[PDB]
């Protein structure tokens, strides 16, 4: 259903952002940095044997006390690499990264101004665990999470690599004219009833568009895209990917919908991060 | 076609639901004879350590003899723990080894078998023997587990395997065929219906044949402790089919009921319930 | 989804009809009999080898010239039994079943029910006028809308001798509408959704065309069929008409079938039924 | 099509109610907290293309003193006191022409449920503060989410004099969830599908907002409507509320309608009801 | 978005197909129906409405048959009022918009297209005959099937002065059929699926009723609307008619809407358009 | 509605073919292997209510000598020799296959991995040809959908077949089908690849042995194809690829408003006409 692959690879649409895009975000982060982070780790009761689990409390947007999980694999190593993973379920749903030898910080998004700020702070919280190797802090997400990660790749001093799967929050004006699926269809359904608010909806969403963070992000990244994904259509993902200003690679799954590369792509990430961190 | 919400018998009645069973006079002879035939080939389990990015778990590519001696495949996932003897879950479905991290992460060796039902059930009985042959496996704590088609398979195995010690049976398929068919238009039970739509004269023979694979009939025979789960909005494996099997199940048993879930069942919540159940059982 | 079978077999709901149900139909047929039938059979050029095909024209409702096909199997016999089949009338080769089993087949093109039923009663007269047709063995047949039509004809035609009625539409309207949301019964429901004040008049009008009310009148032998998963023509509607049907009768029950009914299996049942009947 | 209890049984359906010991204390306290801020209604005449109606942008204090908005539509009639319908949903002022056209001043409030119900109670107080409003003839009305809200307001507002409750949402949550997979009741289900351990707390929390519990308390006259094929707000949910409703009451039943209810037919029924009531 | 992009829709002028007798056919159709006197009859109706007077209208349409309509007159000082003939008839209260904006509203009950278009041309003449109607300000209006009808009327009526045409059906048939599988254009497709040999005759027949061909003839000012996600009446069909439309014109484009079009927002655009036009 | 290439472009659509270097060795070898067992056709007259047609239950050896079943329907006509349609598909009831016998053709209906099925189908022609009343100069092979795909393969593999009727065929231009439609049966391939992301090359190389396009390029017998321009089971660009590569004398009937039903009863008559013009 979207542009052919030859053209997706060369797709660089005109970007829309306000003159204050950077002033808005610098100011948002400054406001929330005025409160100390005060990370608190609580060991939690778990049936898990290969992993230790912590309930983490930290200061996010405007000093509010947010929480995340910290999953630490039981390994000899005094210092471990770390994946901050954005979305929740159970701690046992996040076993992949710890099982591959990474500490995993799992943060649920509890508007985007608040969520992105919380997420930036989550990296700071993870970094503050003494076992975490700060040179190997990775940020990751798929869908809404991939969109959030992508923003964080431009906003976080501490993050060192990005794993961005099938991201949402990318190239809003194009998404809306290609698919009638949730979540992009919420915008369309808003505009259907507020016919006079097209300029303001899109000017507002421009502050949260992944394409605009991508153009700014300088850290290495691995993207994934499903060529049959009609939740997060390929032209949206390729727009962000192609504008992404750091060293990058994309794994293209031509027969997949929004599941993306699934478990195959998980292994690709492990391989990518291994090559990166040696 | 999908039911809107609750569509089967109410819960008060599901708990008392014990329909008449149908089986042939030779049900036991058929399965004894099938297993004897396949035991005439040596199991010859082969475990190959695999190169893996996994750090908490060691992974083996397993080959073993199943139905009529055919070389079947499985994964073995062993969590890296001090213990010289570990408990073991044989899980029926094979994707990546990293898809099966749950049980190893909870301290269980995990044997994952790659999956007509004559062949599959025999393969599955043999997978337990394969798993038991790993020296680190504690044979007093071998568990059999499955959801859907896997759950139906596990249920059969609970009645056919000398070696299995406990059953985890989630939202099982292969149960109470005659009723499934008159409640749901969903795959997989709808394959039976579509067959009968076209072969109008084969009702007796379709149901007599299926009786040999019906989980209700194995349940009536199974003596090992078991934990079942069911989704009351499950329109793939409707609740009356699962409750039929659960209620006939002849070993010590419990069921977790998920009133708002479709075929996902209790999902991750139920995974924890299984860990708790097995802990209480084996301590 | 409907009543269980034990109950379907005993299901006899109260009937509704207007005081002039019979006068209405008598009068409708008399009006259309005031024009001569004037059946015209034209041999058609056909690729068919086992069958001869005629383009038929005859006078139906109010004298309008209706069209049909006649298919005659090439057989020794000077006199052949005949099935009048109701459905448009597609190709002659679509109607090979009955001729292939040794029956002349008259296939009537459908074109409101006042007209269609009248057209259909006249089709039997057209078919009876073919010299090779044995008038003692004229059968009327239809499935769906056809079955409903055939059912009406079983009560309105002097000439018809047996009925084949499969999964019939036009039966027990008020119950249908409260069991299924499928076309065609859902047209009634959608009308009433919008015309909330027209319930009485819709149902009274439809009572003139309800197969249950014809069934109560029909005296000729009949074979019905029903699919227990049929959500176009639900089982309780078919069983209502079947149970009220006043002639010698049988029903074939297909428990796993939807509106396809007994399909090809049922087609053979019909052949068997008619063979047993006409010896 | 029909999927809920039959009508005989719907009319007698009175399920056990669940509410917390503090249901009344919770609401008394919520309203007291919001009454500690002055209402301070402000009416701004608006430039409008309308010729039969005058339109005001209304600002008032709702929940916790927040400045809420509504429309006031006044029909141009040479009467100094008019009856009034407070209608809960805000689109254009021209979307709300029905009540003004029937001679009623119409207050349309732009609409967690703690905040919304409190805002809605205060919208009556805002409407009553318009000098042209006849306080003896203040009516509260809603369909869907609006009907639920109106139902709560019928129990919580000193000032309201009658209730028009169509196809209400926010009723008999535990039952809705086990009958339908449609939005909005399916949000509850989708929550519980994921938070399997939160059934008791979800339903105890929702008990503070259940229309059945407000209905048991409401003393003002009311006209309800229900669609027997409504799978958004299933009939057993509406009938539970209707049957527990403690004021003088009537229900209009639309057997062939889904969530559209009686539509325009029902609108006229309301006009008739209110006319009979207020004379 | 599934049709041509907007830059290309604005320039879209496909080849038109009409028969050599398009004009003779319509002239002759209207002459035939003018041979019967219009004989408009207005009956004041008992109504709960207070801002509007309602009349039950009867008039002679196609071939002299007595067609029905509603006339809604807003109670205003003015001795002469402008008038919107609206094509679709439900309740009078469903048509409050135009009277509430100061326009008399003639709502015509739609009952083939030969008959409906002729009825609709005659409705304008019926409306014009009401003494309070200002004949210099008679507007014709419709959405969907109504828009298609209004469009025809814009070319066929001596007395109409402006056109409001929203999301019209009956436009650029051959293209519709290859873009969408939705009702109503899919009735054409389903016919052709079965009558494979009737392509020429189906399209030649439909050419007499195609809005594109009327548009090319219509000389009165018009406001069109289109939804760029409308898959009932696809944008390329509407733009074909709009672009051929031979009078002074404007189009309001709603990029995120389906067949609802501009809805209430577009209703206000019409009021504005007509105000600017008539002063 | 219309979702594939336009017609002007469908008519010129000749995509690059892919096949393995052993395509022909594979099929020659497969057929030789199955010819090493004797056909041994057995015709049993069946009790039938039919009066214009005689019906036989047929048994014959197909793939690797397995005993396959078919129906033979013979119209009761004076003629000592009759033309024959081998029709590929339940083989349902004998009465479901009345069209061809009614038009004066003997009909062999075969009850239908593809290696096995194609071999069975090639052998069905030999079974039909062994009936003494069959005219071997007028043996026709026919199928729609899966049947049309099978018939297409048989048009290249059978010494005995003389004409092909290929309607809305499945098994054609796999790599394109998969990127145009999400319908069964082509969607089984897509679903396989969604899960086995590393098996694209081997899936498509394997399927190349069964692709109707590749048989078409080889088939030398005359043929009538049909296509539905709204067919989203067997999309038009797949059918046109096979049709356009088809190397024998050919025609195609194009049904612009039809989905997978194709030309239906109208096309049936087109076939009769085609075969009549051909065999005189």
């Amino acid at each position: 259903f979207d542009l052919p692959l030859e053209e997706l690879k060369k797709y660089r649409p005109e970007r829309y952002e306000e003159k204050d895009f950077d002033e808005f975000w610098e100011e948002t982060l400054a406001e929330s940095e005025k409160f100390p982070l005060d990370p608190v780790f609580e060991r939690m009761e778990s049936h898990l044997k290969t992993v230790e689990a912590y309930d983490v409390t930290f200061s996010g947007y405007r000093g509010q006390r947010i929480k995340g999980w910290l999953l630490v694999p039981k390994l000899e190593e005094e210092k471990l690499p770390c994946v901050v993973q954005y979305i929740r379920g159970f701690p046992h749903d996040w076993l992949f990264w710890p099982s591959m030898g990474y500490i995993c910080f799992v943060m649920d998004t509890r508007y985007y101004r608040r969520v992105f700020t919380d997420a930036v702070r989550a990296v700071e919280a993870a970094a503050s665990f003494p076992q975490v190797d700060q040179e190997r802090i990775v940020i990751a997400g798929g869908s809404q999470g991939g969109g959030i990660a992508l923003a964080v790749s431009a906003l976080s001093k501490k993050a060192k690599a990005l794993l961005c799967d099938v991201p949402f929050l990318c190239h809003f004006r194009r998404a809306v004219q290609l698919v009638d699926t949730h979540p992009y269809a919420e915008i369309t359904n808003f505009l259907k009833t507020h016919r006079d608010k097209e300029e303001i909806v899109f000017r507002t969403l421009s502050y949260f568009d992944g394409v605009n963070f991508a153009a700014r992000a300088k850290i290495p990244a691995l993207f994934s895209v499903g060529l049959m994904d009609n939740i997060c259509p390929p032209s949206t993902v390729f727009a962000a990917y192609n504008y992404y200003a750091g060293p990058k690679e994309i794994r293209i799954y031509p027969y997949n919908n929004h599941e993306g590369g699934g478990s195959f792509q998980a292994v690709e990430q492990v391989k990518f991060l291994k090559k990166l961190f040696e």
Side-chain angles (χ1 to χ4, degrees), chain A residues 1-9 11-15 17-18 20-22 24-25 27-44 46-75 77 79-107 111-113 115-143 145-156 158-172 174-198 200-202 204-217 219-274 276-278:
Chain A
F1 81 94
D2 209 334
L3 302 178
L5 186 50
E6 293 77 294
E7 276 169 30
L8 288 165
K9 288 189 215 278
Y11 188 58
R12 299 175 126 276
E14 161 163 10
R15 303 197 299 98
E17 58 178 49
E18 297 291 311
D20 60 10
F21 183 99
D22 295 297
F24 175 81
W25 289 109
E27 189 180 89
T28 294
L29 298 182
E31 185 188 67
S32 292
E33 283 167 17
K34 272 153 146 73
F35 304 81
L37 183 67
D38 290 11
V40 174
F41 299 82
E42 295 164 39
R43 198 101 155 62
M44 72 185 157
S46 189
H47 297 285
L48 293 170
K49 300 300 159 75
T50 57
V51 167
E52 291 165 358
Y54 300 77
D55 203 10
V56 190
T57 301
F58 69 101
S59 295
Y61 183 70
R62 278 211 177 101
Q64 288 151 20
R65 304 296 287 156
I66 299 307
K67 299 178 76 155
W69 285 327
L70 190 80
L71 304 179
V72 180
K74 299 185 171 200
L75 297 179
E77 268 277 355
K79 280 279 184 163
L80 283 175
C82 177
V83 183
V84 184
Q85 212 160 359
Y86 304 110
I87 290 150
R88 193 150 116 169
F90 292 71
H92 86 252
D93 293 317
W94 305 98
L95 290 169
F96 180 79
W97 281 113
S99 293
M100 297 289 184
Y102 290 72
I103 286 167
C104 193
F105 191 102
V106 187
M107 153 87 142
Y111 176 69
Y112 281 119
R113 200 181 158 183
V115 172
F116 290 2
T117 302
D118 287 352
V120 169
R121 296 281 271 181
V123 186
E124 293 280 21
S128 83
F129 197 68
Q131 214 173 332
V132 168
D133 177 0
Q134 299 200 17
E135 294 309 284
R136 296 186 287 155
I137 293 176
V138 176
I139 48 176
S143 281
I148 292 161
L150 180 49
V152 175
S153 76
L155 300 172
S156 185
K158 287 264 192 183
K160 304 289 169 192
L162 165 68
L163 303 179
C164 192
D165 301 316
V166 300
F168 182 58
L169 308 172
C170 289
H171 199 20
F172 292 113
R174 168 76 175 164
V176 136
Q177 77 197 14
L178 277 168
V179 297
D180 67 348
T181 52
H182 184 271
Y184 285 120
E186 272 167 61
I187 297 162
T188 312
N189 301 328
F190 186 78
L191 298 163
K192 278 184 202 269
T193 359
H194 301 92
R195 289 165 182 100
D196 66 331
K197 309 226 174 283
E198 188 181 3
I200 189 164
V201 164
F202 289 120
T204 299
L205 287 167
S206 74
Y207 292 95
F208 311 105
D209 192 337
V211 173
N212 291 350
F213 294 108
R216 291 169 171 73
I219 63 179
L222 177 62
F223 283 65
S224 66
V225 63
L227 296 185
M228 294 186 182
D229 189 340
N230 70 344
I231 310 301
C232 291
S235 56
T236 63
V237 179
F238 267 98
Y241 173 73
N242 289 339
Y243 272 111
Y244 192 84
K248 63 196 191 183
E249 294 179 48
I250 195 173
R251 295 281 176 282
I252 300 165
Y253 297 102
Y255 303 104
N256 289 102
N257 204 303
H258 194 50
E259 68 280 3
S263 288
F264 183 103
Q265 172 60 19
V267 165
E268 290 303 297
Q269 291 172 332
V270 173
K271 289 195 289 169
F272 173 84
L273 293 174
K274 202 193 172 179
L276 187 71
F277 295 148
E278 288 169 359

